[PDB]
Amino acid sequence: SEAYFRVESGALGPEENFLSLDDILMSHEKLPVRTETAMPRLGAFFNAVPQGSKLELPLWLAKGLFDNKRRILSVELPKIYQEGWRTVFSADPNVVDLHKMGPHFYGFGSQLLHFDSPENADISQSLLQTFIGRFRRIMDSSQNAYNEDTSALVARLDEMERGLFQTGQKGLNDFQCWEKGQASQITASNLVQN
Amino acid sequence: MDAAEVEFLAEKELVTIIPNFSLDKIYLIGGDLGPFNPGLPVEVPLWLAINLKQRQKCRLLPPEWMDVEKLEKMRDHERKEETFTPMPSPYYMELTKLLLNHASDNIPKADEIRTLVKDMWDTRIAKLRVSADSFVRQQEAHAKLDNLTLMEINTSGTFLTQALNHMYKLRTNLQP
Amino acid sequence: LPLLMTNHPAPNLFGTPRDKAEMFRERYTILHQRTHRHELFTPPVIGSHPDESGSKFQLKTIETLLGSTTKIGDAIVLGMITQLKEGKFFLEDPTGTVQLDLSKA
Amino acid sequence: DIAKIKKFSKTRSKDIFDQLAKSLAPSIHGHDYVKKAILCLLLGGVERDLENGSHIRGDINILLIGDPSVAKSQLLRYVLCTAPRAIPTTGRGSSGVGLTAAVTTDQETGERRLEAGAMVLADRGVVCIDEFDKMSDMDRTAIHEVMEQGRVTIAKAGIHARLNARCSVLAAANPVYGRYDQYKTPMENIGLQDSLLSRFDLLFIMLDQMDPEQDREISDHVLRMHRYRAPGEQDGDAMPLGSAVDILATDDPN
Amino acid sequence: MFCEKAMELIRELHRAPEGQLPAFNEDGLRQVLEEMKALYEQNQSDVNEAKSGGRSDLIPTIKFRHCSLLRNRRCTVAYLYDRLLRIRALRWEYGSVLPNALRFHMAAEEMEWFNNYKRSLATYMRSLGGDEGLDITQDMKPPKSLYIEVRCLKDYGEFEVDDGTSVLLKKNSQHFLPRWKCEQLIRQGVLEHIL
Ligand SMILES: Nc1ncnc2c1ncn2[C@@H]1O[C@H](COP(=O)(O)OP(=O)(O)NP(=O)(O)O)[C@@H](O)[C@H]1O
Ligand SMILES: [Mg+2]
């Protein structure tokens, strides 16, 4: 029915959604870079920022400054997307804590491909295989954790996987309410709290 | 789509009732029904059957497939097969819930019928779980689910479709 | 906020001991929010390449200067004039009080 | 557990000892000379062997004496976190046996052997002793040999041996009467015996002097530290109680 | 970094997934707009300096402030639009006249938008048929029974059932009435559907 629905996240696509709060928060996360030419007047922030300076700045700003000729700055991957952590994911995707390793792991990784790194293919394959490995546990936990504390199950999941978990939980709760007949009652909305 | 809406579609299925009242043919928009003669079977949609049973105006008769022998055969066939088998009704779970919750007095051996329907439901939801896992593991592009019912698809399909959307975008993010 | 949207009680003649202080506290509050919206406010993010002291009108309260700021030559404070001792004037704000040497005005 | 960048950084930096000392324990404000002394303790001198066969002990021993709430325990904790092979110890929770060595039965065979104590485990390392003024005298008898000679002599079970206990001692104590008394001599504020005090390289008295400017900067630093939250943590998280989080035999961000 | 005040608007809305409407962050909106004004003034000064003087090294920081400005715009527009989404859900989940405790959270322009949306929606609903339209805000759940039993939660005034017939909605009184007449009051919480 006509319930409130957030603007959906478009982080996994070629470009993120403009009005998505999730995409905005995802792109806020910082990204290491190396500056290719000195920038005047910005020494107050990191008077000129000298050439060759290492910086960590937001992903939206890195994408804004980044032109494919690599004229202003060079963009480097975060550690969690480099080969060692990709190997960690290859070991067993179920045990890594993607909530602590950036809450928007898949969205940040997908937008990290925009900079045309030589290991873009490796990053993409790592993201795909991580999702494939974690899918079954997400599915079973979401669809079988009925009416209990879901904190331990949902703790290690990134925000995309948390959305999938809530979708599965919503389906489970809907079917259980149907089977026990509670779905037939007409009830006041959540706004009765006011 | 909600389970109540799947029940709403399931309520269109035809069942047989024995009225205890007299009423000539009534011309409904979806199709005329009746005449309703006392003590004689007449076929009506399930919503009207449940409403008349609630109002003490009829006795519901079970469908031909609500039979312990037939349901045991169907359950054993479902457990024996790997693919989803053809079900006796396209809304068998909702039919079972409505008819047994409202007319357990009319329907004999309702406990056995309910338990066998639950067995079939558990087996087929397990098969659907296996199908979803195989889909994601093998990175299939499409699946074939010929004999699934609408309630079975609705129970798990929102999660599965969202997960497959995410998987598709993850495996296609190198398009240039 | 109107009082119906708050915890504030209705006004009455036989006020509480709190209300007597609340008069002057609210007078300070209105003048304080009036004051900080004037051009004396601090510059925006690198509004000037060297930093500026709020258009040379940067503000402070009494409790801030009761401390390390001895003989700081540019203190500005909003507060109420009081002859808290005879001839020995004091300033007061909701944070505290301090003597006023007003030999030059 | 590369050196070339260190040997370049010592040229790029100007008086790198000062920068290291300032950066020693960021969470603790002030105490600059104490931080320099702790850095000296961490680095140490060079132990001499003389041609006559005598040796000169190279470790540096530091004793911090001071009022309640002047970060002595916190400096010990930082040294425990930063140094390789730093052993924690507290005065009331330790014994002369546990500091040096204990006879214990090896259940693989049943024979009894020496099991190393704190200062033997700390060999070529550091041992941090909090509440040092609360130790028993018989327990400090063990510390005397360790500090004086860099060894401990043991004669128990079947074994008679001089165990190596070459460790720097970083001890923390309160003065007698809890709070330091300005109207008493230091030798009476300090309840320890002069024989023991001779074994420490440096002795620091640090006081809770309630200067308003010093209080201003200290309180500002403390409240800034309490306001800090890590970047890999959500805006309203309580930190999780401990659980295993290491998932490769070698560290990944390298 | 510049953007953090804009991020507080975003974090305010993201910290309430349930769809309820927080108070309008007028002060935060004023601050991000002031920041954009300052950024634009600096950018204009720098860009005209660079173009008139022929000085080329300004162009990276020009692009820096330009991207920062576009970021500020994106954040505030997303904030306003998501607030509009939350407000739009109120017409369907509760009804037309919002309670004053919630109406106090809305901006005046938000109430303007909401009134325009209500007028447009009512116009669309009227135009669905020859006379009286179709009230699609009703029939939110599939129908089970023609009549329902309802219980009065709020002590409430006279409620017309049909013309001269009406029922007094005194608290704890219990009526048996048509579902389509009782649906709005149940959704508003005046009545409790039982059984
Ligand atoms: N200069 C300082 N900077 C930061 N925190 C400080 C400072 N001085 C004291 N504290 C805090 O005070 C608390 C107590 O520190 P602690 O190390 O136990 O003091 P102490 O000198 O050992 N006193 P005590 O254990 O009673 O002999 C800790 O939380 C410290 O962080
Ligand atoms: Mg301490």
Swiss-Prot record, chain B:
Domain of life, per lineage: Eukaryota
Modified residues (N-acetylmethionine): M1
Any one Gene Ontology BP term: double-strand break repair via break-induced replication
Keyword vocabulary terms for this entry: Acetylation, Chromosome, DNA replication, Isopeptide bond, Nucleus, Phosphoprotein, Ubl conjugation
Species of provenance: Homo sapiens
Major location category of this protein: nucleus
Entry keyword NAD: no
Assigned protein family: Belongs to the GINS2/PSF2 family.
Name of the protein: DNA replication complex GINS protein PSF2
Entries under InterPro entries matching the protein: GINS_A (IPR021151), GINS_bundle-like_dom_sf (IPR036224), GINS_Psf2 (IPR007257), PSF2_N (IPR056784)
Record note on quaternary structure: Component of the GINS complex which is a heterotetramer of GINS1, GINS2, GINS3 and GINS4. Forms a stable subcomplex with GINS3. GINS complex interacts with DNA primase in vitro. Component of the CMG helicase complex, a hexameric ring of related MCM2-7 subunits stabilized by CDC45 and the tetrameric GINS complex.
CDD domains per record: GINS_A_psf2, GINS_B_Psf2
Cross-link named Glycyl lysine isopeptide (Lys-Gly) (interchain with G-Cter in SUMO2), sites: K109
Tagged with keyword Ubl conjugation: yes
GO cellular component: CMG complex; GINS complex; nucleoplasm; nucleus
Role this protein plays: Required for correct functioning of the GINS complex, a complex that plays an essential role in the initiation of DNA replication, and progression of DNA replication forks. GINS complex is a core component of CDC45-MCM-GINS (CMG) helicase, the molecular machine that unwinds template DNA during replication, and around which the replisome is built.
Location of the protein in the cell: Nucleus; Chromosome
UniProtKB/Swiss-Prot annotation, chain C:
Disulfide bridge map: none
Shown stretch of the complete protein: 107 to 211 of 527
Role this protein plays: Accessory component of the DNA polymerase epsilon complex. Participates in DNA repair and in chromosomal DNA replication.
Stated name of the protein: DNA polymerase epsilon subunit 2
Other comments on record: In eukaryotes there are five DNA polymerases: alpha, beta, gamma, delta, and epsilon which are responsible for different reactions of DNA synthesis.
Similarity comment text for this entry: Belongs to the DNA polymerase epsilon subunit B family.
Stretch forming the signal peptide: none
Compartments reported by the entry: Nucleus
UniProt subunit comment: Component of the DNA polymerase epsilon complex consisting of four subunits: the catalytic subunit POLE and the accessory subunits POLE2, POLE3 and POLE4.
Swiss-Prot record, chain D:
An example molecular function term from Gene Ontology annotations: helicase activity
Keyword Ubl conjugation: no
Domain MCM: 16-223
Motif extent (Arginine finger): 198-201
Residues given in the record as ADP binding sites: Q74, L114, E115, A116, A118
Protein family per UniProt: Belongs to the MCM family.
UniProt source species: Homo sapiens
Post-translational modification: Acetylated by MCM3AP.
An individual GO BP term: double-strand break repair via break-induced replication
Signal peptide range in chain numbering: none
Cellular component GO terms held in the UniProt record: alpha DNA polymerase:primase complex; chromosome, telomeric region; CMG complex; MCM complex; membrane; nucleoplasm; nucleus; perinuclear region of cytoplasm
Protein known as: DNA replication licensing factor MCM3
Role of this protein: Acts as a component of the MCM2-7 complex (MCM complex) which is the replicative helicase essential for 'once per cell cycle' DNA replication initiation and elongation in eukaryotic cells. Core component of CDC45-MCM-GINS (CMG) helicase, the molecular machine that unwinds template DNA during replication, and around which the replisome is built.
Misc note: Early fractionation of eukaryotic MCM proteins yielded a variety of dimeric, trimeric and tetrameric complexes with unclear biological significance. The MCM2-7 hexamer is the proposed physiological active complex.
Modified sites of kind N6-acetyllysine: K14
Keyword Disulfide bond: no
Binding positions for ATP per the UniProt entry: A244
Keywords from the named record: Acetylation, ATP-binding, Cell cycle, Chromosome, DNA replication, DNA-binding, Glycoprotein, Helicase, Hydrolase, Nucleotide-binding, Nucleus, Phosphoprotein
Chain's gene name: MCM3
Compartments (UniProt record): Nucleus; Chromosome
Segments forming a coiled coil: none
Curated annotation (Swiss-Prot), chain E:
Pfam families: PSF1_C (PF24997), Sld5 (PF05916)
GO biological process: DNA strand elongation involved in mitotic DNA replication; inner cell mass cell proliferation
Induction summary: Significantly up-regulated in aggressive melanomas.
One GO cellular component term noted in the UniProt record for this chain: cytoplasm
Main subcellular localisation: nucleus
Domain of life: Eukaryota
The keyword Nucleus is assigned to this record: yes
Subcellular location, record wording: Nucleus; Chromosome
Disulfide bonds: none
Keywords of this entry: Chromosome, Disease variant, DNA replication, Nucleus
Disease (UniProt): Immunodeficiency 55: An autosomal recessive primary immunodeficiency characterized by chronic neutropenia, natural killer cell deficiency, recurrent viral and bacterial infections, and intrauterine growth retardation. Postnatal growth retardation is present in most patients.
Similarity comment: family membership: Belongs to the GINS1/PSF1 family.
Role of this protein: Required for correct functioning of the GINS complex, a complex that plays an essential role in the initiation of DNA replication, and progression of DNA replication forks. GINS complex is a core component of CDC45-MCM-GINS (CMG) helicase, the molecular machine that unwinds template DNA during replication, and around which the replisome is built.
Subunit structure: Component of the GINS complex which is a heterotetramer of GINS1, GINS2, GINS3 and GINS4. Forms a stable subcomplex with GINS4. GINS complex interacts with DNA primase in vitro. Component of the CMG helicase complex, a hexameric ring of related MCM2-7 subunits stabilized by CDC45 and the tetrameric GINS complex.
